[PDB]
Amino acid sequence: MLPGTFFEVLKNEGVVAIATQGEDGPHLVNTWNSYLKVLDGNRIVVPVGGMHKTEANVARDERVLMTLGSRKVAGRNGPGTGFLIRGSAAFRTDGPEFEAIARFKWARAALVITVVSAEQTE
Amino acid sequence: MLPGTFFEVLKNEGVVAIATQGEDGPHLVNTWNSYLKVLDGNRIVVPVGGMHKTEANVARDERVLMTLGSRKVAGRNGPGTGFLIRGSAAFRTDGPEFEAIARFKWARAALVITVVSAEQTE
Numbered sequence: 001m002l003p004g005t006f007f008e009v010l011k012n013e014g015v016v017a018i019a020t021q022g023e024d025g026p027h028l029v030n031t032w033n034s035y036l037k038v039l040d041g042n043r044i045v046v047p048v049g050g051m052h053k054t055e056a057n058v059a060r061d062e063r064v065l066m067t068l069g070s071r072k073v074a075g076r077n078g079p080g081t082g083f084l085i086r087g088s089a090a091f092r093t094d095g096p097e098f099e100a101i102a103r104f105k106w107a108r109a110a111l112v113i114t115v116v117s118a119e120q121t122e
Numbered sequence: 123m124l125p126g127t128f129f130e131v132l133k134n135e136g137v138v139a140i141a142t143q144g145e146d147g148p149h150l151v152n153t154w155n156s157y158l159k160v161l162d163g164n165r166i167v168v169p170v171g172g173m174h175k176t177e178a179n180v181a182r183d184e185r186v187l188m189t190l191g192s193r194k195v196a197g198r199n200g201p202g203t204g205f206l207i208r209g210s211a212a213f214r215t216d217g218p219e220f221e222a223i224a225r226f227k228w229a230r231a232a233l234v235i236t237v238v239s240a241e242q243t244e
């Protein structure tokens with residue numbers, strides 16, 4: 001499951017980055033630390049407004065990478081830390097995963113990331 | 123050259139993300155908003171400590187993507203904004219580009235991104 005420090009980062013606002021495999025190279029989109037909803041410590045839910053290219057990419061290769069951090073949380077060499085998350089992505093338009101982000105009216109779906117690994121990179 | 127709102131984002135701390143193309147798939151690493159230096163309005167310089175897999179990917183394909191933002195800066199439709207930057211990357215161990223981040227004594231090199239396009243995505 002995700003470590004306590006990961007949740008500490010989530011107590012602070014920040015920019016989350018999500019990389020996927022495009023056909024002409026990688027693609028990169030974002031979300032906010034404050035938007036992420038974690039289910040039972042091993043699945044991360046992201047509210048999807050756009051992410052059309054991203055969804056197309058996931059349909060071809062479900063592997064995704066996600067990073068996030070906060071200068072307000074202690075890392076391993078002083079103030080500031082973050083994580084590199086590797087996992088498989090899936091889009092849902094119903095179910096408890098969607099309900100987790102349904103609060104966001106502009107959300108057309110939920111991007112569900114099943115975490116395989118989490119590395120504190122700083 | 124880079125827009126006004128982009129430079130505003132740079133004055134607030136945050137997590138910058140850099141995506142590259144790996145032989146296996148995409149790769150994603152980070153730096154801090156406060157570490158970025160812009161030279162001549164179209165070249166973003168990043169202090170490199172690690173970024174080894176990143177450097178290897180750039181050697182195979184110089185095209186990279188960078189995202190960054192801040193909740194403290196006015197967005198298109200509300201508080202909070204960010205950008206998707208597309209450009210070509212090069213690692214420098216000397217020259218004015220390296221000197222641009224020499225302040226960081228731990229920097230083994232400078233990752234210079236010559237911006238092709240910048241898009242306010244939020």
Ligand SMILES: Cc1cc2nc3c(=O)[nH]c(=O)nc-3n(C[C@H](O)[C@H](O)[C@H](O)COP(=O)(O)O)c2cc1C
Pocket residue numbers: 015016028029030031032035046047048049050051052053054055190191192203204205243244
């Ligand atoms: C700081 C920041 C936060 C964002 N948060 C979201 C979000 O929660 N949901 C979303 O669909 N797009 C969000 N976006 C926009 C995406 O990054 C992306 O530009 C957009 O969804 C289009 O995705 P696509 O390029 O995969 O089609 C955000 C952008 C920024 C800069």
Ligand SMILES: Cc1cc2nc3c(=O)[nH]c(=O)nc-3n(C[C@H](O)[C@H](O)[C@H](O)COP(=O)(O)O)c2cc1C
Pocket residue numbers: 068069070080081082083121122137150151152153154157169170171172173174175176177
């Ligand atoms: C919030 C945050 C900021 C980071 N800033 C830097 C940085 O300025 N320079 C750097 O070389 N690595 C930085 N890292 C570590 C990189 O993201 C990456 O893990 C490391 O350089 C190894 O790169 P590689 O996976 O390409 O080999 C940061 C990590 C986090 C979570």
